[PDB]
Amino acid sequence: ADKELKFLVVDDESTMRRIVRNLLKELGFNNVEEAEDGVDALNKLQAGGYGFVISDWNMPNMDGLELLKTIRADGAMSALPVLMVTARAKKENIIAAAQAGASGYVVKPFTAATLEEKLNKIFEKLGM
Numbered sequence: 001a002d003k004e005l006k007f008l009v010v011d012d013e014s015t016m017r018r019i020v021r022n023l024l025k026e027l028g029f030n031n032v033e034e035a036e037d038g039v040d041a042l043n044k045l046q047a048g049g050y051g052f053v054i055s056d057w058n059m060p061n062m063d064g065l066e067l068l069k070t071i072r073a074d075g076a077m078s079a080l081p082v083l084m085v086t087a088r089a090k091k092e093n094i095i096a097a098a099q100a101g102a103s104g105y106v107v108k109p110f111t112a113a114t115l116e117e118k119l120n121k122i123f124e125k126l127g128m
């Protein structure tokens, strides 16, 4: 994919955001911003320019399922890639997110290779 693709990394834990951002850099992606919950995320997304969202689920203010659903329902950003990265491991969680339009889904804890693999799976599906 285009190495100037702008990512929004959303998680209420700064340690996780740091992990994801550093994995993105290793993969060649340096245009990366962070948000701390779904409301902060939507503020940055409204600010413009984003091409990919990586998001947690359990966050205050707006959780990642609501964030995903808001994005998919919004005409200005309905096809924006959203990769879920969450400790929610139950099949019903995965179903709710998949059905809500998740581009992909990774369960914490996760390896570097898994994130890379699932990002590349989304790129290939979208022809990025």
Ligand code: BEF
Residues within 6 Å of the ligand: 056, 057, 058, 059, 085, 086, 087, 088, 108
């Ligand atoms: F708090 Be997240 F769903 F890992």
Ligand SMILES: [Mn+2]
Residues within 6 Å of the ligand: 011, 012, 013, 056, 057, 058, 059
């Ligand atoms: Mn969380």
